[PDB]
Symmetry: D2
Subunit: 376 residues, 4 copies
């Protein structure tokens, strides 16, 4: 069969909104690590609207956080359709809606919901190949735009990779899409050769690129208008890009702009952490975790482990190890993963999962899980 | 009240829904109400309408290319009126809120050239991936947890609007945890129902009224045992709700909109998008083929992935997953799908007869499972069954 | 009911005012409430706060450089609460409206360099012209028409808030036409009073209640004859008002704010501006000198124009107009003004003790005529009279 | 004595708002001459908010009207701090608040209020000198910026002129202020010489410029940040610039964004028309008119004529001529001045009074007034 996933660059308007939301979150957590933050951003030609509810002792400058984020992304001139130095920034940020515990670890969930984690040993970083290489294509586009290798590139870009599988194994790459914004000073033919040479070939493994592979580079031609000029961007509209590219299920909650007390974000991080350590322990080839919560209840209402027939130990045992080695209570997750730190703007583009310096990507429980099962 | 370490081996799956008064769903309804008003006048319109709702205000933005002439403010107020927010005591009033508009006219790069002799051969307007799903667990071929999660919050709307429980307010959320034993439904492990209300009711009267008027008329008694946990307003008072206490945005309930987590998702929102957006039309068509594959008796559960490249008419990929329940080889099912269905962008439109103002009704309680929608018709089931030789 | 062509020779002058619920005045009060909250913490703050109010929403924008830490949303809701808009039936509610902020941090070109050894020698922050005025027609040395126009709409607020006429709503406007005979007041030719109200009152009961509770306790009976026209709610029902039916903007009632048209105006708004803006402080000082010139008995009516150039401390022009009522040569009065008053930007601040949160109170019912304001003190009158030799 | 007045260019943010409001009014009147329009505009870094109440059968594109207006003004690049092609435009335009006459001329006033008109024979256009030459300085700045004579100029500019009077006669000009935005590529010394040579000297009469005249050209130095980038702009915040520069009184109503059924605008136009024709008829050297209205009443509640001792015929007679020759009822004004035409964007910068192609500047009643008095 074929499976397809996509990603978008840090200049895509939905991702601009995600990064502004988490830049606000980071600036707040730097002063007030216990802050409650629920920040929603809306970007369109000329303006950023930052809204939501915030409870914090922190004192932050929303305007400057927003301009600096957009400057880092690279929209700094009206020729690009958007300018961090001259766009409008509006705030519509209020307070969180008008009981506690002797042990904060026993705090009930702040909302109901369901979340999934996923891992698979088909890549080094234990992620599905399609989303992994889609992410690397747009990240390479930004890297090559920012270091001056291809200075006619502009921030907005989209990628899409179609993989072929045979009996759960990767046979190769069937189709690649790469669309990138660019200035007026480059023709489409020169663009396609440069993108192929400096973006696609350095990233996609040559063993997976046959002569049957289809390459769609700026398939409809010029791409000069981009970013918020062409399209609205909103926080939480790339939740599949943010996670597993559709290879795994998704419970619906957005990540960006939410402090770690929102189970939508922190329980999804914890579910990635469980699944990755199960696969890294060699207990399965691929593993999907579902957890759900009820508002006001600390213990998850459900925990499901799915291994698609690839488990190396009984699935009844895998469920036991998950409960034995992980604390999936709302504030348990926060403590287990040390989440009260300004680390979240970096997650808001190129994927929350896959990059092994995030705390939910550490495999520091794999050897323990292996020992607690039938040893090594 | 089941102790820890009593079962642990039960296979559980949980899905949630939200009512038409939840702020994200309000935004979805406004975007599609604008879309419907436009399509009533201009069936070929291009619409990409994104709505932001907060305490006191609605912001309607996006990109629209149409000959239609619509009143954004009046469309917005009517939608919020019908949802039920018509007084400041509820935290939001349709008659006095602010309505702002930030609607542009789409890029010149979007281009209405590069045409096709056959319009059905026009390329997709964007890349992306979409999923469809069906399963014979229910009469409407939807997963149980999302189906009954939808039913509960729509039941709360029902009894709120007809005056059975007048002290209810629009904002509400439900959640249902089902237990499965080897593919089949054994029962319901946990039910969550949080509903906004007025000051004129205490929480004990609330919980008794919710169980008798909402939960019991919806969930089959055969799936309810002494082990079923019931969490009805589990944090107490729910007086402040709607846009007052939370932001609402178009496209922030896409899992509620589809299959409640049972099926995967490609990530595209539905509401505010005209039928030429494959994010919406291809997901509707993917539901159409999965439902017809299951209704034809060719599988018990079926998931379909399709993807597109901008400027390309044929899907860049088609995948059918039957989870071992197929009654014919799955590679044979993929061929049937490619030939019996037109998955090209404008082919979708003609196959599902999509150029009509039908979309506001989709924007709350699920785009799937209600059988008067065109993509829920099962008119290819016998044909598919014949072509597969059964 | 005076026929056309009956008098025609009467010299008439008309001025108007508006209540604290008129949408423009709401905006002025919000701008100065923000200014006051800032000055309470940071007396040296630079503030330029512009407010936009519309059905459902408040937009607070402008430029602010301060060490203060203020809650824009809470300051806004409290101000609207105190005005009286606290329910959607009135068309606007302080507790559920939207509050947006568009406040920047002032240009780097604004510059905090180019300093002065003596801070009183600092240059003006902008150019512009300003007027002040006084006249001994009234005990508070203000023109009659604006004084009694102010009084009527403040009387309507008074009887609305203390429950005398509870069916009144905040939005209201008054207008008074005086007849003059050779400089002195002969009487009142026409009175207009339009007030918003609730559904619980008809127009005949309204007009009788307005005449007995508002008009008669305010206007001296000696100025009311059988020829006085009274127009009380002359178009009938006034139920929709406030921001619901009209936009409100900071600085759109500058004639109401000053002298009702009797005196000229330089064009600068007052509200939302910290005391380093000569638009506000120099107008306050111009009132201060005109009032002291008249209180000293040096003229019966006195108008002052001052103007500034950006970067210049001394006014670029000073003009005193006494309309033939001076008791000393007018050129002598100009010299007295230049020496007895410090009209330099920061000199104004020290002379009037302006670095205090006193400004929200100015933003409705007039910046002039209320004698607890610093610029209404008449503490230089005897000095001016001595220096002129009387 | 000395008297001072100021003006601002079409690039000043308050005037940008005024011009957008009246550009919307003009586009509406072009299709629907009986439209009711009350349009308020708010501009700040990155965004234009267009609000108000409108009742019309017309179909107009607010976004395009706004971008075209700002393009004409000259803000077309982020280097200038504002760009018509990429700023945000938001609408908050509603409907006018939820009895008629057999004769529309007998319609009552739509609001109460007071308005003034003024004229004086001290200039050709029967306007006070200070506001007249202040207007001409900023209009010359824009003319010389747009025709390429001084292409480093930028749209935002302010002017101020201080005149000296002796017994009602002009003796000369005491002080001139001229501040202009400019690009980075000009030094302040070169700027001051060019402004003096190409802006000030061509405009101010040489007989009024002595060696005692003070010249303040960009008095605080560089002026690169301007327009909506530095300061909010709002409709109706230049009402003294719009009229007589403070030489005459003002009743308070703003002009821009209002259709001619708003007496605030149309009765002020009519009062200028009365005063100008009285002075043009040689019946006075200077003349101020006050009119007031009551809502729902067609006849003005008061009409006052003031001539400051300069009347050549009895003032009791001047009041008679005003009533005999002018229709000051709300819809009478509209018919007397033929106001239902898209002519109003042109008024929204450089003064509503003074330019003799506007209908309220025609002196077509002067000879009649002269004949009705003691003849010629
Ligand atoms: Mg998007
Ligand atoms: Mg959620
Ligand atoms: Mg949400
Ligand atoms: Mg998409
Ligand atoms: Mg107004
Ligand atoms: Mg000013
Ligand atoms: Mg201004
Ligand atoms: Mg007015």
């Amino acid at each position: 069969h074929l499976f397809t996933s996509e990603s978008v660059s840090e200049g895509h308007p939905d991702k601009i909104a995600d990064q502004i939301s988490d830049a606000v979150l980071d600036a707040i957590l730097e002063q007030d690590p216990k802050a409650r933050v629920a920040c929603e951003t809306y970007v369109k030609t000329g303006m950023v609207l930052v809204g939501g509810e915030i409870t914090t002792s922190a004192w932050v400058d929303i305007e400057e956080i927003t301009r600096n984020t957009v400057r880092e992304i690279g929209y700094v001139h009206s020729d690009m359709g958007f300018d961090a130095n001259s766009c409008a920034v509006l705030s519509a940020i209020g307070k969180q809606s008008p009981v506690d515990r002797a042990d904060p670890l026993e705090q009930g969930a702040g909302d109901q919901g369901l979340m999934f984690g996923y891992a698979t040993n088909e890549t080094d970083v234990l992620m599905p190949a399609p989303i992994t290489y889609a992410h690397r294509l747009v990240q390479r586009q930004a890297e090559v735009r920012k270091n001056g290798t291809l200075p006619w590139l502009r921030p907005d870009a989209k990628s899409q990779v179609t993989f072929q599988y045979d009996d759960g194994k990767i046979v190769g790459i069937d189709a690649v899409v790469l669309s990138t914004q660019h200035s007026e000073e480059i023709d489409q033919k020169s663009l396609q050769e440069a993108v192929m040479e400096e973006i696609i070939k350095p990233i996609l493994p040559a063993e997976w690129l046959t002569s049957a592979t289809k390459f769609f580079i700026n398939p409809t031609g010029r791409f000069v208008i981009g970013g918020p000029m062409g399209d609205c961007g909103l926080t939480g509209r790339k939740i599949i890009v943010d996670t597993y590219g559709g290879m795994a299920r998704h419970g619906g909650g957005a990540f960006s702009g939410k402090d770690p007390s929102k189970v939508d974000r922190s329980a999804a991080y914890a579910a990635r952490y469980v699944a990755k350590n199960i696969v890294a322990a060699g207990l399965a080839d691929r593993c999907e975790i579902q957890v759900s919560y009820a508002i006001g209840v600390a213990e998850p209402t459900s925990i499901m482990v799915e291994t698609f027939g690839t488990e190396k130990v009984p699935s009844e045992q895998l469920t036991l190890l998950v409960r034995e080695f992980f604390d999936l209570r709302p504030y348990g997750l926060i403590q287990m993963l040390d989440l009260l730190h300004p680390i979240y703007k970096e997650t808001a583009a190129y994927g929350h999962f896959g990059r092994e310096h995030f705390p939910w990507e550490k495999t520091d429980k794999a050897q323990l899980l292996r020992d607690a099962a039938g040893l090594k």
